[PDB]
Amino acid sequence: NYSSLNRAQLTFEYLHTNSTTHEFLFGALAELVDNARDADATRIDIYAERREDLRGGFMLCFLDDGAGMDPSDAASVIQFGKSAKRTPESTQIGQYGNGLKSGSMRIGKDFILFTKKEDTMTCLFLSRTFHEEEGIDEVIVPLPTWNARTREPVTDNVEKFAIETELIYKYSPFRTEEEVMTQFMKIPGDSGTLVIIFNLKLMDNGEPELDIISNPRDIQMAETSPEGTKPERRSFRAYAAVLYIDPRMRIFIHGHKVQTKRLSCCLYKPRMYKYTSSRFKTRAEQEVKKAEHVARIAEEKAREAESKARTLEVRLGRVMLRQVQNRAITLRREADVKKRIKEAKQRALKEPKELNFVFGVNIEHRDLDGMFIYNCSRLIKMYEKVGPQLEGGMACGGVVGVVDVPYLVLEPTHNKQDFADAKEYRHLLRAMGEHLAQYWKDIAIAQRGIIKFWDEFGYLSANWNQPPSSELRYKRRRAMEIPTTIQCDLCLKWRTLPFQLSSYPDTWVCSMNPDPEQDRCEASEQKQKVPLGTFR
Amino acid sequence: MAFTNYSSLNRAQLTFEYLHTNSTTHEFLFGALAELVDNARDADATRIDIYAERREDLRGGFMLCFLDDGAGMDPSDAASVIQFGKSAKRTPESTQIGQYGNGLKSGSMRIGKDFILFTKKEDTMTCLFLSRTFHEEEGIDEVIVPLPTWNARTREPVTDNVEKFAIETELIYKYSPFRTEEEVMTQFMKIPGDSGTLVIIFNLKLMDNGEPELDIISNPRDIQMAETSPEGTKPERRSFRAYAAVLYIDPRMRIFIHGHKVQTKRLSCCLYKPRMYKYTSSRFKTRAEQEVKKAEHVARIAEEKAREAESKARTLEVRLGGDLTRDSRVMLRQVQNRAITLRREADVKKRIKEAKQRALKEPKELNFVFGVNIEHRDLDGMFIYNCSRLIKMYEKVGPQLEGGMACGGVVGVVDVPYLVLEPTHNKQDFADAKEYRHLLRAMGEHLAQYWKDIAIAQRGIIKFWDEFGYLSANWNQPPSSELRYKRRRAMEIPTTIQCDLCLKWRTLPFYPDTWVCSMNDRCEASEQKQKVPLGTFR
Ligand SMILES: Nc1ncnc2c1ncn2[C@@H]1O[C@H](COP(=O)(O)OP(=O)(O)NP(=O)(O)O)[C@@H](O)[C@H]1O
Ligand SMILES: Nc1ncnc2c1ncn2[C@@H]1O[C@H](COP(=O)(O)OP(=O)(O)NP(=O)(O)O)[C@@H](O)[C@H]1O
Ligand SMILES: [Mg+2]
Ligand SMILES: [Mg+2]
Ligand SMILES: [Zn+2]
Ligand SMILES: [Zn+2]
Prior knowledge:
The structure is a homodimer. Chain A contains 14 helices and 21 strands. By secondary structure, chain A is α+β, with helices and mostly antiparallel strands. Chain A folds into three domains: 12-261, Heat Shock Protein 90, CATH 3.30.565; 265-276 and 354-479, Ribosomal Protein S5, domain 2, CATH 3.30.230; 278-350. In chain A, the strands form four sheets. A nine-stranded mixed beta sheet of chain A has the order 8-7-6-5-9-3-2-12-13. In chain A, α1 (12-19) crosses α4 (99-107), α2 packs across α4 (99-107) and α9 (278-316) runs antiparallel to α10. The longest helix of chain A is centred in the middle third of the chain and has 39 residues, at 278-316. The termini of chain A are far apart. At the A-B interface, β1, α1, β4, α6 and α9 of A face β1, α1, β4, α6 and α9 of B. β1 of chain A pairs parallel with β4 of chain B. One magnesium ion binds next to α2 and α4 of chain A. Chain A: ATP binds at residues 35, 83-85, 95-101, 416.
């Protein structure tokens, strides 16, 4: 029993320390998007609610129709490091038990979250305003729960519940129980979550860092954009569109749909190269050696306990007989379950241990090139130049590369904007650069003449940065090379259209497609067939 | 200042897995080691020894030890180590590097699974033991930390709870590298002064081939990354000896690696024709003004309260003119002493305010220094320090962002105060990207002015580099090693060296172990400052 020993604890200032991980402000917003995706949301709305009395003049709201949280799920939010998603073979993005706290506290001073699941709905209120005004150096968090159907409090301590709600009514944007219930009612289904960040951070001139005015359909960085500034680093609509390699969840900003995309579907002559990863193989082999030791120990424990149970039965020829017998039963089921996981890791070990590099030419935007590196579907690095692109030449200029890296090979840094194992990441970039050179040889556009290739798509200007010509002949020349893809708003499937779109998307559903083969939500989804190239 | 009793409410808590989460901030492994070096400098150490202790029974084969002779920690200071976010350093316009209440924990847990720290101060010695091995083995999901303290002279336990002390020490003997009290005391004996700290990180992380990430074998005087170094690899990204040498803009603390002194340096003193440009910072001035206004308010309130108590002491004394009772005597003394206390406090706040007002009138400028790296022209770009600690190195700006020879070879240095920029969580970037980008743009413009001011076009560029021994066509290749060319570069950059005794920096007119002023020539010849000529921008 360790009850007298010191525990590590979190203090108020740590909320700030943790938030300084996000020098890229959109990567703080991405944490909350990730959480909606991981909760199996089919939709997230990211929108502003104007509030001239709050710092920055609006609250930033994230509303999803995902699985929601029950009261114990909600309470584990403030157990830093706790992540039910951190399970073997987990393909959730969440793993570190931190992102909502680091991201929200980068964006604003305070947040209030509303969540509903089955018959409960819970509010979690993180108010740094409260801690400052009342001199609190711990991190104290109101967490009231109500019954979702009757709106009665669900609490084991009515005095505590009264203090919690009084704090919410005093310090949150919502000053009455009615106003709080109004927020719960914005979650219209049986489950979902609404996260509201408020008292947003200001620049030195008193304006918020997030600009929702310049383009009312977007969330932009409030800073001047130089010449080669990437759209994804100043427009959240642009960043959200490529945040996942395999978008399904629909994203809306200020009520306007984001045209999410699969980068490999947006490129000229996409080709895929399979890269055998020694790291992937070694780590899978070690995860097996470990599972087989874990199953071995459990079996010896179960075998001892069963032996003692049998001997005690014959000796007794009671109460204690069942402590021994059931202990044997439980160790045996423990041993069997670990043997099954050992076997499952052995089976997976035989699968190919390969990373799939995909390359194609960004003919619409030659200057937006380099590698996009995803980690368990989540974008980590964008526009990373490799191989010949690291020279001052036109070789491999315009080429976009995409790869999805599993956690066994790389895990992210604390801010999910870099990779924690720099040595192995640098190795990956060299491997990607070698394959990029092979892609470039393979499509041979440099053997035939690289300037004349770009001329054909209408790059009249001498500066590498300006867009290709917008006259009609060059528009159609470019468009002919890139299929038109679109997601159904009802069934979430990805479709191709046999014509070109005119221009911010509106609602589209399968039955609007003139293609008789994709004409109904019940028609099965066609997969991109990216052709395979060969290294060396 | 709480409205009610909040003891029933939920607190946020730290769990075991967060130690790992926190450590993933350090993708640059040397940045995790730098956290511990920063703590030693902040504790006013005159020396830190970073060394390996071979232990074939522990993961990675050795423990990494950080031994300093700084101010150490008493038991309450040690307990606050594990209050994440708590930092007594976080004070107005601080010149300590620490401010976030995290670096020891993020850095140590990047490097290894476990650490044990020994520290001495005044009459106490304390051990702090962070054992992820213990947590895994016993299934602990909180973060539980043994923190025993002994009397430094008698070695008797200093504790409020002898049962807790026995549990704490037995955890250390079970899970740490030191399995008896005697072995622990041997570690305290390595702190030979009245104060200091020894941090030992062990069960080091391994690469897939089973070897540690840190290579202490290839060069037994260094700590290197166990990785191949391709062509464009900077020394400070592969050699901890190289990194440590430039980690601080104004080195004082001596650094030893495996017992061998690091030749720390001031980058601005290693360059050809250094020039300084002053850049006015509006944020620096605005923020310093707000800090003065806060101190003015604090002083004014304290003066009001002191005058109130002083008035009451005067009027109460007259009201008790004829009164000889013990009651009236004790109550008059109570208010008289309260007036004395508040007057002393008011006079302290006044002095604090007046010091801040005087500091406010100093120029609120950043100092950019530029020079040509004629010894290694490929090692160029900007070195950006923050409260004297290196954050960004080799950052190319201005003309250097083009293809060309313009500003090739130029190194720039700037020390940014905390009022202007603060660092990211891993102290390897800046938290305010917008303002950092503004600073880079300004540095690039001043760089272009520097290149005009030294006017290499006048003598010609090709011939400039040829004269210092760069006859080869390639940019990446080192300059000639002929005697003529070594001396020609040597006349342009005076050799400086630090005295091992007094820590002063001195200049020599023209070794690996030690050097002192009398080898030049006495330690209290006042330290001479290089005057860097002033340029103007536009
Ligand atoms: N939108 C949401 N819907 C449902 N559950 C959520 C949502 N946001 C947060 N959660 C829950 O809150 C927990 C903590 O979230 P967070 O702090 O982001 O850590 P994490 O997602 O588990 N790991 P990471 O994001 O990698 O640090 C999650 O594990 C979920 O259980
Ligand atoms: N070598 C040391 N000598 C003396 N005190 C030390 C030493 N190392 C750590 N400490 C103490 O431990 C505290 C916590 O260290 P740390 O976790 O590094 O946070 P910090 O230094 O205060 N700020 P930061 O490094 O920016 O996160 C410090 O504030 C000191 O009080
Ligand atoms: Mg998360
Ligand atoms: Mg520190
Ligand atoms: Zn459909
Ligand atoms: Zn000296």
